[PDB]
Write a protein that binds this ligand. Structure first.
Ligand SMILES: [Cu+2]
Ligand SMILES: [Cu+2]
Lengths: 75, 42, 89
């Protein structure tokens, strides 16, 4: 795979931004992984761990995001 | 079951095998209290 | 970064018996650094579980299984039926 960007020198730009590159069909079967910190999964079979809502926090392997303290904030 | 910090766990040793190797496992001070315990090491 | 090992990579093992006699059925990987998120430790048997003759201790559920066909266990003992040479001990 190639990603290439050439900018024309028009004396002016905002760079191209790329995220979430997902390539399927590699290495046949793969194994399950614990959810990353700050992410939660509710039911089995999740292809991705949903992000915990703001003002809430969580850790690895959690099935739910614990509520946070009153004197604390969390993106 | 919320994740446990350094306080609620003690580190205990498994049973000695034939070759003489043990595993340092981490045990909740009282049963059923947390997950994501530190990985056992030789 | 590490895996979430299935039933094939984590094995149950008993901790060292304490003074009171309590053991924890901790889950241990077969080789170090291969997986995380191991099953939580649970209470083991009180350092005196002795399976009868013809049975072996199953770690998944702490009970004496009746073994398989064509195989013997000898129970919590030993036998010295062979005498070609002097047996060890
Ligand atoms: Cu909670
Ligand atoms: Cu193994």
């Amino acid at each position: 795979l190639y990603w290439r960007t050439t900018a024309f020198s028009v004396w002016s730009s905002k760079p191209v931004l790329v995220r979430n590159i997902a390539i399927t069909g590699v290495a046949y079967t793969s194994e399950c992984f614990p959810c990353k910190p700050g992410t939660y999964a509710a039911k089995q079979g999740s292809p991705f761990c949903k992000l915990c809502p703001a003002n809430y926090y969580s850790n690895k392997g959690e099935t739910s995001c614990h509520p946070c303290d009153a004197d604390k904030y969390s993106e | 079951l919320h994740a446990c910090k350094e306080s609620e766990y003690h580190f205990e040793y498994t049973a000695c095998d034939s070759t003489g190797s043990r595993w340092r496992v981490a045990v909740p001070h009282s049963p059923g209290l947390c997950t994501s315990l530190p990985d056992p090491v030789k | 970064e590490l895996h979430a090992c299935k039933e094939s990579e984590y094995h149950f093992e008993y901790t060292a018996c304490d003074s009171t006699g309590s053991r924890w059925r901790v889950a241990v990987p077969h080789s170090p650094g291969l997986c995380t998120s191991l099953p939580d430790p649970v209470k083991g048997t009180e350092c005196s579980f002795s399976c009868n003759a013809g049975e072996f201790l199953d770690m998944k559920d702490q009970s004496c299984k009746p073994c398989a066909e064509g195989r013997y266990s000898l129970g919590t003992g030993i036998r010295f039926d062979e005498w070609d040479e002097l047996p060890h001990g």
